[PDB]
Structures are given as C-alpha cells and as structure tokens.
Amino acid sequence: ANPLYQKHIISINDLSRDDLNLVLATAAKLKANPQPELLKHKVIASCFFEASTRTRLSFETSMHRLGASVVGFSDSANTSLGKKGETLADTISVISTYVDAIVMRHPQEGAARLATEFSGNVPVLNAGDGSNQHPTQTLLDLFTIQETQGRLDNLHVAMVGDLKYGRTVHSLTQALAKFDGNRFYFIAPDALAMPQYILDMLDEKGIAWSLHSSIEEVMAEVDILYMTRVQKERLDPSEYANVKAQFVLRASDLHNAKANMKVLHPLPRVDEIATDVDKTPHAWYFQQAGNGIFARQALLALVLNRDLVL
Amino acid sequence: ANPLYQKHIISINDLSRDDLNLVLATAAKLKANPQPELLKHKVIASCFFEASTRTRLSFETSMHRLGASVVGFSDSANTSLGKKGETLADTISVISTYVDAIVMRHPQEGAARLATEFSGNVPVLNAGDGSNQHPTQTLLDLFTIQETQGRLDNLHVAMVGDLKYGRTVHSLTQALAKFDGNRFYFIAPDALAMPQYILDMLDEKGIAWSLHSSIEEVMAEVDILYMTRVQKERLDPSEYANVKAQFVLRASDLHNAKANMKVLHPLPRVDEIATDVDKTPHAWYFQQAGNGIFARQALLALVLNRDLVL
Amino acid sequence: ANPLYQKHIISINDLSRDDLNLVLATAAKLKANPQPELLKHKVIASCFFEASTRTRLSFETSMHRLGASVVGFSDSANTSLGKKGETLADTISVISTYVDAIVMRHPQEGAARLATEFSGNVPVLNAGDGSNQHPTQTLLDLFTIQETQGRLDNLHVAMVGDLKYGRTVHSLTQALAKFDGNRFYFIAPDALAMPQYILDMLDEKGIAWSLHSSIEEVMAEVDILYMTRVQKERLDPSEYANVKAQFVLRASDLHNAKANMKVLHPLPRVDEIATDVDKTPHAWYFQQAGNGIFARQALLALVLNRDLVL
Amino acid sequence: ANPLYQKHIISINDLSRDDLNLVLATAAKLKANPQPELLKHKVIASCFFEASTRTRLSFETSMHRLGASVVGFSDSANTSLGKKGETLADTISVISTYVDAIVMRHPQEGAARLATEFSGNVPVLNAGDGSNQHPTQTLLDLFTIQETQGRLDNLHVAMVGDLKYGRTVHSLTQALAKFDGNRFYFIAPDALAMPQYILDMLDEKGIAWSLHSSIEEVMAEVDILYMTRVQKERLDPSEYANVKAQFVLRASDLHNAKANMKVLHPLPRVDEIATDVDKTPHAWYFQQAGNGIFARQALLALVLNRDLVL
Amino acid sequence: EAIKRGTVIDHIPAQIGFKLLSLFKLTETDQRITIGLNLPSGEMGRKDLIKIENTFLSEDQVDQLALYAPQATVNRIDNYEVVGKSRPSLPERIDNVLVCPNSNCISHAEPVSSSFAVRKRANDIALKCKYCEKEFSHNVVLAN
Amino acid sequence: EAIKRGTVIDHIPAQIGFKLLSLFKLTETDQRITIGLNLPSGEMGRKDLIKIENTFLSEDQVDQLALYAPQATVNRIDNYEVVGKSRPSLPERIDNVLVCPNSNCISHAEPVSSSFAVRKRANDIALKCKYCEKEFSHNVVLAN
Ligand SMILES: Nc1ccn([C@@H]2O[C@H](COP(=O)(O)OP(=O)(O)OP(=O)(O)O)[C@@H](O)[C@H]2O)c(=O)n1
Numbered sequence A, B, C, D: 001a002n003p004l005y006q007k008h009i010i011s012i013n014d015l016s017r018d019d020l021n022l023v024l025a026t027a028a029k030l031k032a033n034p035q036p037e038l039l040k041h042k043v044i045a046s047c048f049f050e051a052s053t054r055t056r057l058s059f060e061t062s063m064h065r066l067g068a069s070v071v072g073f074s075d076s077a078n079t080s081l082g083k084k085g086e087t088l089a090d091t092i093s094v095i096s097t098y099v100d101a102i103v104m105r106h107p108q109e110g111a112a113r114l115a116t117e118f119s120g121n122v123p124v125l126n127a128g129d130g131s132n133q134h135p136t137q138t139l140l141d142l143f144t145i146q147e148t149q150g151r152l153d154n155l156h157v158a159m160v161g162d163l164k165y166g167r168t169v170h171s172l173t174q175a176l177a178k179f180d181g182n183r184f185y186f187i188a189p190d191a192l193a194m195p196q197y198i199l200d201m202l203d204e205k206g207i208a209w210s211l212h213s214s215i216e217e218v219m220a221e222v223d224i225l226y227m228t229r230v231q232k233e234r235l236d237p238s239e240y241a242n243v244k245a246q247f248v249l250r251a252s253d254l255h256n257a258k259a260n261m262k263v264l265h266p267l268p269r270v271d272e273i274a275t276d277v278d279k280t281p282h283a284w285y286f287q288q289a290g291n292g293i294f295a296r297q298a299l300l301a302l303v304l305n306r307d308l309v310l
Numbered sequence E, F: 001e002a003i004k005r006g007t008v009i010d011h012i013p014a015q016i017g018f019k020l021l022s023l024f025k026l027t028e029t030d031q032r033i034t035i036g037l038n039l040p041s042g043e044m045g046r047k048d049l050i051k052i053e054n055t056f057l058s059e060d061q062v063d064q065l066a067l068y069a070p071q072a073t074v075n076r077i078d079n080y081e082v083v084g085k086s087r088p089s090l091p092e093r094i095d096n097v098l099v100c101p102n103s104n105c106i107s108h109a110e111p112v113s114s115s116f117a118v119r120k121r122a123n124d125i126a127l128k129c130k131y132c133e134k135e136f137s138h139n140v141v142l143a144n
C-alpha cells in the first residue's frame, strides 16, 4: 500500500516532499529496469480537450511501456461538443465505468478536480487544467533537475519569461519550495513578473529570491536555467520588441555558465531559445521531455499498483 | 545485422535492387508465417499531417500484427498547429525521445528527410512527403507485381493517368528501372505526360518505353496495367471531358487481356476504374492494398530487428 | 482654400489646435444648418478591413447627408486582396482611380499612411489603423466635450480602463494636450496603465496628471468621465475579478458628481457602464455617438469642398 | 434607338466591331464631358457571387457617376440562394422585378446567359462567368489600347502568362481579331499555352501569330505588352521555378522597348510585374483600371438610355 | 596606394566596414574600390577603412553613417590631396536600411521603403516609424 | 601592399568579390583583410581581389568558389612567398549558401541548412536538393 495508491494526481499542492521523492525514486528504478507487463490488463483513458504534443504522446507512450491499453481523444467530436450538454460530469461518470484511470487536459481551471467527484474509484490524473495546475510537468522537471544536479536542495534556479501567467513555473517554484536552501532568480518583463502570492509564499518559508533585468546578470551562478516562452500576444508588439533581447537565450550567452548548468524549457518554444544552443552541452530540454516518460510511468505504476516490488 | 537495420526509409533512390528484394522476401515469409510478438515492447509513432485511409491504417495495423504499440495523430491539434512554431524539427526531436520508430506523412517535400536529422537513432519511415517520395507504396506495388507475375524482370508495364504529377508512378518507374528488360507504356493526356527526366533516366539505362493514345492500344500485351486517377482539377473541365474516355477503364476493355494481366491502382479512385471491373479476375487493386500489410510489416521488422531469424 | 482642403486625415499628431477648432466649428454649423447637396456628384469609398458599426455607419450616413454616393466593403473577404492576395498598395492604387476620397479602417498600424503614398491626389481618412490612430473618433469626442462643457481648456478629465492599449484614449490625451490648463486623472488596472511615452509628453508640456485606483476616488471633481472597456481578455480571469469593481460605473457612483459632468464612452461598451446609468442626466455616450455624424460630416466637407463655406 | 439599347452584354462573341467602336466612342465622350444625371431614377443591381475589387467597385462607381442607385451583394452567403438553396433562375426571376438592369459575376460558366432567360426585359451585364466571358474587361482593355496607341488595327500585341485558362486574354484576342492587321505574340509556359481553338480562329482569319518562350524575346516590337498572372497554383512548384524568370517583367527588361509601348494587366497582379516598373512611362495597368469607369459607364448609358446622346 | 580622386571613409569601428558596404550598396559601381578591415589605427587598435574613387557623398549620405560609425571621418580627395574632410552628423530621417520592430506594422508585407524619424535624447537615439508611428530605441531597431 | 603569410583570392570576376564576402561571411574575422574591387587586369579586364591574413582554406572551401569564380586563383602565400596556388574545382555538394527554388520544400520554413548535390551537364550545372530531391539548373538556383 504505497502512499500514492489509487490517489488522484490533481494539484502540486496535494503532493508532499515524500510524495515527490517516492515518484522520482520509482521513475529512476523503472528507467533502469522497465516492467513492460506491469499494467497489463489495464485500460487507460487519454482525454485531451485542449491541444498537446508532449503531454499526451508521452503519457500514452508511458501507458504502453507498462503494457496498458489506451482509449481517448485529442479534441471534441464526441458527446460533449456534438450533442450539446453531455456535461463533463456525465462524461466522466460514463468513461469511469470503462477505464482504470483517467488522464485529462482541459481549458477550464478545476476540471480535473471536478472529474474526481464523478469518477468513483477511478484515479484521474491532471495533464493540465486552465491556468491552474500541471503536476506531471512539474514531476518531470524535478526528476530532470534531480537527475542532472543529483539533488533538489540548495540549488540556484533561475526562471525566465512569462512568470506572471505560466502555470508550470508557478508549480515548479511551489514544488522546489518544499525543499531546502534553494535560491530563485526571476527574470521577466515588468508586465509579466512572477506574481506577488508566489513571493509571499517564498518569504513565509525563508527562501531567497530576487528580480533581475537580464539572464547575463545571473548566468554565472545558476544550476538550472528554466526557460519558458513569452507569448507576444500578452504584450504590445512594440512593447515586446523593446525588452525581447533580455529574455531570449543564445549560445554565446552560455560563455560563463557552470559546467553543471542545464538549460530547461517545458516546450514548445518559439524563439526564446536560439537553435545554436541545441548543440551545447547545456541544452537539456529534449532530455527533459524524454524524462516525461519515466516520471509519468512512475505515476501510473504508483497509482495503479498497491505494492511495487521493484 | 541485416542491410536495412536501423535505416531510414525515405527515398526510393536510397533503395537498391538487393534492398527491394530483401524487403519483398521478408514480406513473403511473414505473410506465410506471422510473428505477432516480434516487435513486442516496441512503441511506434504514427504521425500523419495529411489525410490518408490506406497508408496510415495499414501501417498501424502492421505494427499491431507484429505486437508493437502505437501513438500518433491524424492531423494537427497538437503543438505545431495550436501553439504556433513548434517546428517540425522540435516536434521530431521530442517524439523521438518517446518512440522506437517514426512513420510520417507530410505535405512538404523533404519533411521525412528533415525528421531524419533530428530523430537521433530513431528510424523514420516516409509515408509520403509532398510530390516527392512514397516508398512504402512502391514496396507494396512491387511485392504485388512480383507475387502475381512471379518476377520483376522482363515485364510489360503500362501506366495510365496523371503521369506528370503522380509521385507513385514516378517512384514505381524508378523502382522497376532497377530491374532488367522491363518495357513501359505511358498513356496520358498531353497536359499530364510522364515527365522528361523519367524518360532520360530510362534512355540512360537502355529501357524501352513508348507513348500511347489509349489503353485499348496496348491492352493485349501488358502484364501490369497500373492505373492512377487523373484529377480533373489539374485540367479544364472542358479539356478533361474531351480525353476522358481514353484514360478510364471498364470491364469490356479487358476483353483481350492476357490471363496473367493484373489491374493495379494505388487508390483511391474516382471513376477511372468502373466498378464493373471489380468482378473480373484482372481486378487486383484491393489485393494490392492488402499487401501493404505485408510489405509494411516486413519494413518494420527489417528496420527494428537486427537479425530476423525466420 | 480652407486649411484642410485635400489634406489626408491620418494621425491626431498631424492636426494643429487650429485644425481641431476648425473641424468643430464646421461641425457646429452643419449641425445647425444642413447642406444636403454640398457633396453632390462626389463618390466616396468606405473600405473597412476590420469590424465596425459606429465608425463605418456614421461615416457613410455623413456622406449621404451631404449628397455624396458610396462604394466599398465591410470585410476584405470578397476582394482581390483577400482572395488572390493583392497588396493594399495596388488595392489603393486602383480604388483611387475611382473615387474622390477614401475612408479606411485597417487591422495593421500604418495602413492609412501607406494608402496615402498610393492614392495620388485622393484624400484618405483613417477610420482606425491597428493600435495607432483613430482621429475621427477624437474629433467627435472633442466636439462632444466642448458642446457639453462649453470649452476645451482648464478641464478636469478622467479616463478609465485599458489605458495601456487604448488608441482612442491615447489620441484624446494628445489632442486635449494641445489646449491649455487641462488636468488628467488616469484610472486603470496596474497591468493596463497609461504608457510612459504619454506621461512624458504631458510633462514636457507641464500638464498635470495623476493616477488613481478607483473611479469613486475622483468623481467629485471631474468634468468628463471618459470610460473605455477594460479589455478583460487582456488579463487573467481572476486578476480581473479582484480589481474589477474599481473600473466599472453604475448609477450609485454618481451621487457626488458635478452637475456639468458627463460620462463618455467611444463604445461599444460591455460591462464597465451599467445600464442604470443610461437614464441619468450624466449619460452622454449615445449623444457622443450621434455627434459622430456632425464632425465626420464637417471633416468630409473641409477635405472635399475647396474654399471654406461654414 | 442606339444599337445596344436594352441589349444584354454577355459574350465578346456577340459584339460586332461596330458595337465595340460605339462603346469606346461613348466612353471617350463621357470621359471628356460627364453626364451626372443621365441615369437618374434608375436602380441597378450589383450581384457578385464571386470575389472582386475592380470589376464590382468600378461598375458601382459608374452607376453613381451617372446618377443611378444600387442594391446587391458581394457574396451569396446571405441570400436565399446560399441559405435555402434557391435557384439562380428564381433569384433573377425575382430581382428582375425590382431593378432596371443587372450586373452579375458568377463562378459558373453560362450564368449570365441563364439570367437572360429569366430577367424579362431587364438587361443583364456579365461581370465574369467562370472561365467563359468577361466582356466589360475587354471593353476597357480596348479603350485603353486605342487611347495609348491611337488605333486598334495593325498593332503588335504580346500576351503573357496563363494563356490556356485566362478568359480575359481569350476574350481580348477574339476582340482584337475583329479589327485588321493585328499580329500576336503568345508568351506562356508550355503547360499554359494559348488553346488551339483560339489559334485556329486566328488562322481562318489569316491573322499572324507566333509563340515565344520569353518576354525579352519580343520586347523590341510590341506596342502592347499584355501581362496576366501566371497561375502558379496551376503548376508544380518546381516546374514553375524553372520557367518563372521568362514570364515575369521588371524595369530592366524595358531597355529596348518601343517608346509608345504600354504594359497592361487586368489585375490583380502578384509576382509577374515587379513594382520597379510602376514608375516607368510604360506602366499603364492602373490607368487601364481607371479606364474601367469610362466604358463601364458608356456601357450602362447605351443599354439604359434609349436614343443615342454621345 | 592613394587614389587620385574619390572618397575615403576613415576610422570605421571594427565589424562596421562590411555592414556599410552591405546596407548602402557601396560596392555597386564600376569605380575602383579599396577596403581595409581590422587595420591598425594607432590607439583604437583596429578600424575599417573604405576608399571609393571618382565618387563623393552629400552631407546627407554621410550623416547616414552616424548610427554605425559616429567617430568616422569622411575624406574628400581630389588630385591626390585630402581637400575637405567632415564627420557624420545625426540625420533627420533614416530610410531603407532599418526594419520596424513592430510585427504588426504595415511596412513588412507591403512594397514600401522603411523610414524612421530621428530624435536624440536620454543617452540614446529614438527612431519613430513613418507608418505605425511607434517609437523605439536605436538599440532595438539596429538589433535586427 | 603584398601580404606576409595568409591567403589571397585573385582573379574574381567583377561584382563577385563582395558577393563572396557575403555568402561565406569571410569578414567576420579579427584578421587584417584588404579588398580590391574593380581592379585592372588582363585575362578579364576588371577583377576583384581578396586578401585574408593568417587564414587558409581547405581544398573544399576553395571548390565552393566554383559557381561564382570558376577561373579564380587561390594563393597560400607565406613569408612573402606564393607557397601553393590552387584553382576552384566543382564540388559535389554546396551547402548553406544556396536557396531551394521549390517553394513547397521543407528547407524554407525549418531551422535546417540548405544543401545540394552538384552535377555537371554541359551548358549548366544541375543542383539536387537534399530535402527536395528536385533538381534545378544552377542558373535557376543562383539567378534569383
Ligand atoms: N590620395 C589619397 C589621400 C589620402 N588618403 C587617405 O585619407 C585618409 C586621411 O589622410 P590624411 O587626412 O591626409 O591624414 P590623417 O592624419 O589620417 O587625417 P585624420 O587624422 O583626420 O584621419 C587616410 O586613410 C589616407 O590614407 C588616401 O587613401 N589616398
């Protein structure tokens, strides 16, 4: 009876330090020694009501690597969009009589939580719900940070881009805040600054953070340079252009980076990360996405199997 | 270590006579004696950025007949169409960290080749790229020709329809040109004639070919009557109507065909092949498509297994 | 001839204080004594490449109130630019050979200015160009403010809402900043504050302005409460909700307003002005819209009619 | 009455040489001395079932320049034919009870002729019908050629581009073939050559014509370089690229052109005429478009005004 | 190595000589041109140098160098001697070579030449697009 | 003046020198470079000349000059002595510099370097795009 057995994976707020570690530990074991028949006989729903390349494809791939089957959809051409109503509630109430677990991405905040109240004992895993949570993305970022840094404590972590609206940067900050001595560097346009509540949360825990103008400023001391895109749509085409240069990364900027420094990006990117960075040893975004496989496999195993004998 | 192990299947130009034979030979063995657990534990991406009925469905079916799993999409509702950019490059770089091989159809010429430079060691198989290549279609046509004719040498092959723009007729001509003594008959509207470069290629190799007005003209001597559709859109509705009659096949026209003559069509068809032909022993287009299963199974086995012990 | 005869009306920036007074004085005369045939024998183009109900309808009504004819469109969908991708330049190069003046609204900044370089001796009037100018809107606003307050100097003016992106408020501020003694009160969410370049412009001219977080905070001394719609979509759903009540107006908020104070709104409105304000004596947004006729009419008369004729 | 009074204007084929001269002579008089009230009290329908910027806008401007009113539409989306699938016949049967003349452009060949059988005594003017006719385009072209060359006989005329499908060039060739001594030069990609039926028509009349693969090859003797857009989409992307440079015009190509030579283009253009040609004295495509007014105006006057009145 | 008659642009900061040749199409003539990149100046270490025989520039053509080579020195040479010499003065406008940073600006898709109004101020030059009327820091416009 | 040790591209046809400086971004170095454009010559009347100090080109970097300066001469000059001269021979692949004429080619919208297979055909040179597989005359690929 592991901690996460038959548990819903909805909010990063619902996960403890132990919970996170349990998941990452399992992700490591399964990576080193796969268990392709672990979830055999299991059928899992993959319901995406919003676009996705990596979250859906990796989750579904993770299900197969464990031997589970898949049913679901990439958008609405089902009873919900076609024949009106078919509330999300009734949609889940029905699907939960078919599958062993539900993975869902939805445009409204709270969707995944809602599914939870109509899915009976079928565990639902939140693959993104509006501007709220995106827990499996955080789990893979942490595994990726712990893998390349060998730890989640006393790290110098810089976050760049749209810190105001990015749900993944919010979740990662929250997550890392469950560990000790980490130091944050928020680099963003004035209009997209890390929200004040995140800063209060950090103060409340005695965690150090500071605001910076450009990457070049903090480069020399970061272990993890977490990049995110700054959608121009959230700014005035003119406004953007004036501050662009200080939120986009290019090879040369890495000239004085620590040997261990790894550049991360939840993806997709547009131009905030120049392609000439891809060839550097620091580029670790594709490896990061590759880890989604292990983090997500770990999650499905912990939630679907009461006692992982690995 | 077979010739095609971990090799990309991009262009018919990259395949040798031996390569083609190796694939067809394997297709025959797997047909006679399936190996349903051959690709067990393997997960294959099925990425179609353009419409398809037979290419995608057969490839995916072929994966299952070998025991492999599947993840992918039929169009764009992923990060590439939804959230802008997400270049094809980044899309492949990411997907290749999930799957064991990538099957892709794309509207731009060169797409599959491009995927190859970002997929690491994950083999990509081209299921069609613009007006360039469509290698798995050729492989199944050859297997179908070799199966019904018992050979790929000294054949009388007539090709009808849009020879100017058809990528599959171009590829098949190229393919057959890798064998000896074949004789071609090109029957097409003046506006859609087989392109000159194909004709030079044939001259250069001492292969005989000739242009004909109607099917009725060459009927009595063809072993393979390869039909393709002549999309009216590529002609003036009026222009078309004037030459239609000589590029459409109907039962009666087969009155003087050789007993061995088989009618082929890559499909789909509109009217170039009347339904009253379906009942004749010559109709072999549905069998042809059925062979896509074996040709494609063969390909996946050769590419994913270093030593097929069959 | 009169100072605006055959002149283009593109940017508020190119209109002197005398020019604005001239338009208003003309708008007042025509309003008082109509000239139904002043522009008889003139054909004007009404070209809208972006949605509009008041700016396009009033302008066209103005043309008719003066005796002129109209040709044009409400969207570019059914025009060569739109179907066969014709350039805006060529579109103007051509239309300018047909009409005596061109009224255009376009989604891209600079459009109207661009038309100017290809319209030969045909006047173009900017009905809105991206987030840049909307001069005729400001002209009717000014007329409206002077009509209700009796002057355009030494006024207390408050502007509320999306001050960061609103082009009408940017333009009105510039315009009013050409007159003397005006003092401004900017009420907008922190994320949508009046841009710095506007604030500097006001300083160089030694014009008094101040920021306020609520409408109720300045009610008592404003002569003009200029309301605009808080572009909600420009904010996080929850962000908006927290500051909302400070940027919406209702009848009860007008308890301590000055007797002469008028509430204006370029429209359309959505939420910001409750309907219970409609019947209060302060409500002047529809009268404001009605004033679009005169002004839009005065503008056309000055541009197309040689010598003055007030 | 005048020879065109109440006549339909459907096909260039139904207009005698005298008819063309009559329209041009009238177009010249109106151009010189306007008749603003010639069609007062007339209401004309402008019905476009296909996109258009010049043909519809000039025609409507013409109606107003003559004092007539207008009713109509730019697309059929919001009409009974369009929503409740009403027949074109019924649409005309009905509209003909409202107006004094009908100007229509329709995607299907024969449309205008069909309207004719259901419009009672209401004149219909073909503004374009599929790939068949576009008479008013030819009338303005002729006017333009005669205005710049001083005559319509013994001219050297070159036509470039999509000669196979271009209806305006097919029509202009027929029209010019009604006058004497004209010699044609057809410059088009092999795939888009002038149709045989046109070439025969020219032979029966003993009219000299020749083919040329490049514009530069005939420059020195042409009086009219009639450019049309090479419908690229009608060719293979790569096919086009190889022959492209031979069908595009730029300023440098005009080095040895005749002083009186004019470059015409029915428009819209895309690539075929570089903008550096715009300011050369040979550029006459916008003047050509402007001439649409006169002509379209002359046409309406002749059809709707009884006795002549040049 | 000292042209008979022509112009000589001295003291061009490193990596700007090429740009100048590019942006202003200086190499598009039949006239003999002489170029020096990364040459020893004496103090500034290295600097680019361009010579163009039988060719002279207006004070406006020279002013167009201000943003790229402010300290540069344009030398007019006739009959082997450096008759007159001048330094680039900030221009009133800059057309054709700059690109408006506003992606929604009409200048990008249409066939018109770029154009910005030049106004010196707080530690840098501000450029205003003739079209969208958006103003930017010479640093952001030049950045691309 | 004659350079010490480095390389010197001689006999470039007029209007190709600058083109070469651009296409192969040869001026993006901190090395002393002297350039002569539209200089007098005999075997072609007027030519361009590029000198790059302390820099050398692999025999493949030279072949890449073929489509632009087929009759050019590269010199290895070291210690004031013309070490080893070399003539540009047609390479079998040209990358980065060319642009594919096929507008529907994936190379345009993606972050990939262009690349063609070279093949001589008498009268012209055939260039086949790696992505495309489409072949065009160098006259079409270069002449844009
Ligand atoms: N016929 C000539 C005359 C002069 N120059 C060039 O003109 C520039 C300036 O020369 P000059 O004013 O005579 O001496 P300087 O000390 O260089 O002047 P300044 O300090 O202002 O640069 C130098 O690059 C010199 O080589 C030249 O190339 N050919």
Ligand SMILES: Nc1ccn([C@@H]2O[C@H](COP(=O)(O)OP(=O)(O)OP(=O)(O)O)[C@@H](O)[C@H]2O)c(=O)n1
Residues within 6 Å of the ligand: F001, F002, F003, F004, F008, F010, F011, F051, F073, F075, F077, F079, F080, F081, F082
């Ligand atoms: N120390 C040196 C030596 C030679 N060169 C240049 O390198 C080329 C050498 O040419 P050369 O050996 O003198 O033979 P040529 O008679 O010039 O004939 P060709 O052009 O075939 O070399 C010339 O540009 C010469 O000016 C140089 O710049 N510095």
Ligand code: NA
Residues within 6 Å of the ligand: C068, C069, C070, D069
């Ligand atoms: Na009217």
Ligand SMILES: [Zn+2]
Residues within 6 Å of the ligand: C110, E100, E101, E102, E105, E106, E107, E129, E130, E131, E132, E133, E134
């Ligand atoms: Zn701009």
Ligand SMILES: [Zn+2]
Residues within 6 Å of the ligand: B110, F100, F101, F102, F105, F106, F107, F129, F130, F131, F132, F133, F134
């Ligand atoms: Zn290509």
